[PDB]
Design a protein around this nucleic acid. Structure first.
Length: 493
DNA sequence: TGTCCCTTTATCTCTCT
DNA sequence: AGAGAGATAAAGGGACA
């Protein structure tokens, strides 16, 4: 019989009990732990079920699942219960930060290393705990933290990096690799190719940073004489997750895309300069003719869909859904292109297909409003949130649907919608802001932290902002959100 | 196999004017 | 508003006990 049979059965037995108290895990959650944490993780969750959710730690199920669904999740679980008290009291971290550290492959290692190295990294190297956390909050955090301790001096002193830059580089998967690669390649990339430290840091500061730097060093000469590319364009291709793949694919497919489809190199760089550029390019080479056939979509329109993270996913999904969205849902081809020309355009298209008739019929929105909500990064999130929150926001909070749509129609709109519903009463009732003012603050990218900034200043006032009126603070918050308020604080000082 | 670490891709959010 | 950066997650491979 098949070997994995016993283990699979074990998985399913134990899994069925976790649908019960104190955890109440759904199928989605249970499957997730099985795939990544394995069977030992699922058994550990059950084993530790009461101990985790109850006092002391008082973790939510989500947090328990977040910790459990990685390699070694059994180990992270045992360690969290051991070290969350220690790190919260002896180092002053919040439980959320502890969970974040725990929620990665080898979580036990990161947590233990943070427990061992946080004092030395703050006292002798002047890092903040938040910086120590960020370094530790990726696979191999243990490696990254140790490598930061070893190399912060020689990176700041012998190579001229600020600690901020070193932290930025370190704070990715394989962080240890990017650090070590920057020690070796920084002089070479700067002195031989005239790259700034800043540019090298941008290349280094992604997952697989080491891979992109070495590939930059290799392909920069070939790309800058044989293809008409500037260093700046190369840097932009490489300064993304999997920049190595993106670069090799730009050498491969630039001439092909140009000659065969009439694209400019500028258009090719744009496609390559997003996470998964390789995937986007190869998908363009294969789908552009298909999309453009019979006076269909223009090239320009295809290039735009391609020119976002996961543009491959966006492209393929357009090709599948362009017919059904236009025919059965009444959307113009131009509208479909707009929904898809953002990160996660695939997700947004699928969510418009699913939710457009519902939001129109059940909530009284127009397809134009639905398109506008969808036409941002995380559009799926904004659309799903409008569906959930329109009734409470309108009925209980006084908002017009037109205002709810305005809040949802920016990157992170789901975050803004949730924050308005959460902070509108205290902001209006307890401090005399008008709803229109709250909506105005929230109808911008970064709507959430802008609203949180305001509530903070009105509930635990910084003197540094006391000269500003509520209306001025509002005017500021609409202008530049949280950053603007924070900048204004620094100025007073 | 369980655990740790690294790399690529996709998606979501906030910044920076 | 569009480009850049950072965050969070899913999934696969190498490594080794």
């Amino acid at each position: 019989q098949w070997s994995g049979a016993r283990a699979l059965e074990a998985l399913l037995t134990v899994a069925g009990e976790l649908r019960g108290p104190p955890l109440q895990l759904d199928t989605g959650q249970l499957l997730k732990i099985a795939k990544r944490g394995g069977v030992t993780a699922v058994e550990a969750v059950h084993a530790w079920r009461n101990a985790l959710t109850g006092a002391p730690l008082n973790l939510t199920p989500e947090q328990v699942v977040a910790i459990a669904s990685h390699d070694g999740g059994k180990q992270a679980l045992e360690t969290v219960q051991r070290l969350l008290p220690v790190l919260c009291q002896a180092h002053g971290l919040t439980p959320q930060q502890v969970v974040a550290i725990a929620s990665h492959d080898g979580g036990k290692q990161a947590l233990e290393t943070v427990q061992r190295l946080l004092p030395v990294l703050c006292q002798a190297h002047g890092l903040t705990p938040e910086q120590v956390v960020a370094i530790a909050s990726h696979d191999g955090g243990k490696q990254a933290l140790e490598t930061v301790q070893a190399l912060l001096p020689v990176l700041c002193q012998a190579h001229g990096l600020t600690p901020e830059q070193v932290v930025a580089i370190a704070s990715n998967g394989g962080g240890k690799q990017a650090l070590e690669t920057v020690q070796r390649l920084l002089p070479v990339l700067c002195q031989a190719h005239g790259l700034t430290p800043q540019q090298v840091v941008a290349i280094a500061s992604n997952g697989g940073g080491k891979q992109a730097l070495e590939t930059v060093q290799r392909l920069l000469p070939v790309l800058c004489q044989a293809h008409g590319l500037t260093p700046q364009q190369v840097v932009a291709i490489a300064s993304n997750g999997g920049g190595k793949q993106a670069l090799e694919t730009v050498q491969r497919l630039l001439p092909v895309l140009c000659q065969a489809h009439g694209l400019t190199p500028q258009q090719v760089v744009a496609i390559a300069s997003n996470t998964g550029g390789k995937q986007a390019l190869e998908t363009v080479q294969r789908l552009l003719p298909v999309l453009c056939q019979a006076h269909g979509l223009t090239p320009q329109q295809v290039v735009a869909i391609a020119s976002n993270g996961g543009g491959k996913q966006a492209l393929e999904t357009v090709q599948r859904l362009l017919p059904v969205l236009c025919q059965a849902h009444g959307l113009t081809p131009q509208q479909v292109v707009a929904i898809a020309s953002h990160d996660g355009g695939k997700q947004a298209l699928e969510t418009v297909q699913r939710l457009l008739p519902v939001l129109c019929q059940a909530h009284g929105l127009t397809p134009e409003q639905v398109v506008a909500i969808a036409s941002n990064g995380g559009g799926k999130q904004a659309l799903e949130t409008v569906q959930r929150l329109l009734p409470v926001l309108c009925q209980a909070h006084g908002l017009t649907p037109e205002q709810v749509v305005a809040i949802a129609s920016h990157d992170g709109g789901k975050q803004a919608l949730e924050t308005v519903q959460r902070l509108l009463p205290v902001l209006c009732q307890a401090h005399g802001l008008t709803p229109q003012q709250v909506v105005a603050i929230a109808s911008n990218g970064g709507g959430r932290p802008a609203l949180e900034s305001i509530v903070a200043q009105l509930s635990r006032p910084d003197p540094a902002l006391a000269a500003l009126t509520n209306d001025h603070l509002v005017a500021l918050a609409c202008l530049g959100g949280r950053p603007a308020l924070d900048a204004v604080k620094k100025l007073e000082h």
